[PDB]
RNA sequence: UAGUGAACCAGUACCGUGAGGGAAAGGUGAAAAGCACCCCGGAAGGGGAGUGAAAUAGAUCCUGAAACCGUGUGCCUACAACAAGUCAAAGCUCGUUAAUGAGUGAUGGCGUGCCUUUUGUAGAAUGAACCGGCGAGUUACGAUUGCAUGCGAGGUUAAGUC
RNA sequence: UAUCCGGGAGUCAGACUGCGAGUGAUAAGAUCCGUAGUCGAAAGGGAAACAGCCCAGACCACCAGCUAAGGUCCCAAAAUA
RNA sequence: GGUGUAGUGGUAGGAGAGCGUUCUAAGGGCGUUGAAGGUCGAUCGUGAGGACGGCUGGAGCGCUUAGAAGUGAGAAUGCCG
């Protein structure tokens, strides 16, 4: 089986309308503000929960 | 005088994964932008981070601009000069291989 | 005596571009495709400009036909009525008159109908 | 010089019509309601542009088939599975379901665009000769010298 | 008021003040043109020729004479290597009405 | 006479036709050789008499 | 892409056991004056600052098309069955070689590509992935016919010498 | 318009339709002839679509008119004549 | 040049007349106050096609007459990129 038709511009595009990344889980670091995802450990200070870790 | 661009030529990785990460980006805050670059796993992640970061020092140095202002204005990736390469594959013949190359251009302004 | 090919393959090429620009997609950017297309809008246009008076006139038809409806009388009969009155106007005036000057279209089928009993 | 007049959409007051289907054949009574919806009885028609007006269908329970067809018009549909063509005849539809009765002729005669189903929308069916459409003050339509 | 007249095997409503695009006169730029054949007068009161409405005229001035966008005739048969291209532009007048009587 | 306006004798020399350039030349594809045949080859036709 | 295969470290690279086969690859700028110095970056690469007439002439360097990819958007588009256009056309946007202007276009009518080969092809017969370049009735010697010029019951030189 | 003289060809696979025959089964969108038309090399209108059937031969422009075949209740122009 | 009549579908193919490309000769010109080339434009001619403006570009090129051709690509499971 091979493509009967090239595919065009458009419908490439249209296929691709899905292909996409997502940033998800970001907010504010409670011990220095700066963004972390949620439930990790916050990469700049090392705190989670409060707590330095 | 109120925007600044920073550009990466050449850069070994695939346009259209670079175009994933650069549509996070595009149209939003130096802060933002850093953060999401940040925590993006993806492997042109830290390249865009990087030319951002030169943008925006160039945009502070060279220009003298407010830093805490700045927005990413414009960001895309470009086709670059392409490697031909060739792989092996069975009964005896090849198969070319593309090693591709990128163009990553960001511009932040003012506001 | 050598003549390379020179520029006019690029000129004929983008015109025939030119004249395709408003296609979809290959349709406006490839040569080829541009070209096989606009022949075919170049068959269209011919056709078309002998179509549109059949259009035209058909158009004038309905309304006329209409009007003479809403005055009591049927678009046939309308027309022979006004062709025994030797009244010369065309489709397009008539319908012209029934849409705007109603009062004029239904002079003229008082006429026509005036015909039609003598 | 180009000046045929062309009707827009919106400028076109269009009128609500009442029409008795009481012993009127089945096909004359959609020929006119089709000609009404799509607006052939204005001079302002225009094949582009919506101009017909609204018509209000009663009594379509007493609508008349002639000859045999209450028994032997048979409506056929498809579910597109195999084996899967339904029959409903025409006497059957009549005394159950006569809004679709109604409706399938006048979408046979309506055109198969848009525009068409467009016009279709403005069909209202209704058995017996209550409607409840007053607030659109809808004037009644002789229709036996249109048949 | 208006009028309908018979022009170039047409026929065209006029208005006084209007201009009117028609198959070209044989007339000089600036020069008065009168059309005779008016079929009908409408207005206020409506005037039916039959053919011609008895005595009536259109008075206009030759504002203009030019020619229309160019018209592409390319008659060609698939698959019978064989097409002609041929270009047209169909002269007109344009004529700016005065009176009507 | 004068290099610059040089005009030789009316039919004296006339403009060689090419075959095979474009369809409306009258010559195009098979640049007069008709459809297929011996005589359509190069180099085809049968010797003399 | 011509011109030697070879304008350039070419019969080289490469291929073949061998005979043998056999490439690609020219152009910054007048002059390197080939970007001191500063900033981001590990570097690469960029942004300034400079040289320069020009740096979107920065060494992949004269020009820089098309295919192809991307960014921004003036208009349209999530009830529609579309050889993709043409004719008619509301609305929106904009104002040109100023022309009865331009872009887009709801909606309606009409409408089965190009080529080849066939009696007949939308054809479920063939060919083309697209774009660019190259690619097919020519020359020599003779035969014959038309046309033209010179001379004309005449016309004419060939080789050869200067 | 025919002749004649000379230069240049292409064509030698035809198809269907009507009518007259053969082969065939008085079958074939079969085959082979005669005769006329069309297609071939002919667009346009009709027959839903539909080379060969009916009407008719596109140099072009028109938002003019009259007709051919075929049609006039809606799709869809014209008679619910 | 005017008038009138008639005519102007077309494959194979015959005839005629033209467009465009490179180069040559002569004349007459154009170009760092910006050639060729590229790009865009709503421009002109019956056609092939011809100008005119903006931007880019950076050094050669038109026009008239005549002459010679490696003179026009969309298809060759064409070749190279
Ligand atoms: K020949
Ligand atoms: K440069
Ligand atoms: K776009
Ligand atoms: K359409
Ligand atoms: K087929
Ligand atoms: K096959
Ligand atoms: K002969
Ligand atoms: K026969
Ligand atoms: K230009
Ligand atoms: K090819
Ligand atoms: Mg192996
Ligand atoms: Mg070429
Ligand atoms: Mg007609
Ligand atoms: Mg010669
Ligand atoms: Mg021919
Ligand atoms: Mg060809
Ligand atoms: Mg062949
Ligand atoms: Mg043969
Ligand atoms: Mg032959
Ligand atoms: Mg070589
Ligand atoms: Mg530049
Ligand atoms: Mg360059
Ligand atoms: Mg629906
Ligand atoms: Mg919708
Ligand atoms: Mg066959
Ligand atoms: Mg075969
Ligand atoms: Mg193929
Ligand atoms: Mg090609
Ligand atoms: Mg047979
Ligand atoms: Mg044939
Ligand atoms: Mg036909
Ligand atoms: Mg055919
Ligand atoms: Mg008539
Ligand atoms: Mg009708
Ligand atoms: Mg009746
Ligand atoms: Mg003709
Ligand atoms: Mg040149
Ligand atoms: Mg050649
Ligand atoms: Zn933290």
């Known amino acids: 089986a091979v ?51 | 005088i109120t925007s600044a661009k920073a550009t990466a030529k050449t850069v070994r990785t695939s346009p259209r994964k670079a175009r994933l990460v650069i549509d996070l980006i595009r149209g939003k805050s130096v802060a933002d932008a850093i953060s999401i670059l940040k925590f993006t796993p993806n492997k042109s992640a830290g390249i865009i981070e990087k030319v951002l970061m030169s943008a925006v020092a160039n945009a502070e140095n060279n220009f003298d601009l407010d830093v805490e202002s700045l927005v990413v204005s414009e960001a895309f990736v470009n086709e670059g000069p392409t490697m031909k390469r060739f792989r092996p594959r069975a009964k005896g013949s090849a198969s070319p291989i593309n090693k591709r190359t990128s163009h990553i251009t960001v511009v932040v302004t003012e506001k | 005596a050598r003549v390379k090919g020179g520029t006019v393959t690029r000129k004929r090429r983008k015109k025939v571009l030119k004249l395709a620009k408003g296609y979809y997609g290959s349709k406006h950017t490839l040569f080829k495709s541009a070209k096989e297309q606009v022949m075919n809008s170049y068959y269209y246009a011919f056709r078309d400009r002998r179509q549109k008076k059949r259009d035209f006139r058909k158009l004038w038809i309905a309304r006329i036909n209409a009007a003479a409806r809403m005055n009591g009388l049927s678009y046939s009969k309308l027309m022979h009525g006004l062709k025994l009155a030797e009244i010369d106007i065309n489709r397009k005036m008539l319908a012209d008159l029934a849409v705007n000057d109603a009062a004029a279209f239904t002079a003229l089928a008082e006429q026509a109908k005036d015909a039609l009993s003598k | 010089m180009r000046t045929t007049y062309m009707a827009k959409a919106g400028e076109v007051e269009r009128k609500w019509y009442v029409v008795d289907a009481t012993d009127v054949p089945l096909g004359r009574l959609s020929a006119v309601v089709a000609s009404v919806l799509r607006g052939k009885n204005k001079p302002t028609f225009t094949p582009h542009v919506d101009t017909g007006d609204f018509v209000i269908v009663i009594n379509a329970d007493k609508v008349k088939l002639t000859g045999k067809k209450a028994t032997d018009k048979i409506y056929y549909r498809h579910s597109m599975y195999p084996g899967g063509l339904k029959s409903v005849t025409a006497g059957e539809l009549r005394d159950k379901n006569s809004r679709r009765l109604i409706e399938t002729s006048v979408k046979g005669m309506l055109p198969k665009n848009t525009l068409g189903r467009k016009q279709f929308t403005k069909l209202n069916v209704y058995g017996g000769a209550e409607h409840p459409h007053a607030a659109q003050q809808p004037e009644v339509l002789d229709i036996t010298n249109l048949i | 008021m208006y009028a309908i007249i018979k022009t170039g095997g047409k026929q065209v409503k006029v208005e006084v003040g209007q201009a009117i695009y028609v198959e070209k006169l044989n007339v000089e730029a600036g020069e008065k043109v009168v059309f005779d054949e008016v079929i009908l007068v409408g207005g206020e009161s409506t005037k039916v020729g039959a053919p011609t409405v008895a005595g009536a005229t259109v008075e206009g001035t030759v504002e203009k004479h030019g020619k229309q966008k160019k018209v592409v005739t390319f008659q060609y048969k698939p698959k019978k290597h064989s097409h002609r291209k041929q270009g047209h532009r169909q002269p007109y007048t344009k004529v700016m009405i005065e009176a009507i009587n | 006479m004068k290099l610059h306006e040089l005009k030789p004798a009316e039919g004296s020399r006339q403009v060689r036709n090419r075959v095979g350039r474009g369809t409306s030349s009258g010559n195009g594809k098979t640049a007069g050789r008709g459809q297929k045949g011996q005589k359509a080859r190069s180099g085809g036709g049968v010797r003399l008499g």
């Open chain 1, 3 to 53: 493509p009967a038709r090239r595919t065009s511009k458009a419908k490439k595009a249209k296929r691709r309308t899905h292909y996409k990344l997502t940033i998800k889980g970001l907010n504010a670091c409670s011990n220095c503000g700066e963004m972390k995802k949620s439930h990790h450990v916050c990469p700049a200070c090392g705190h989670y929960d409060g707590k330095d870790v």
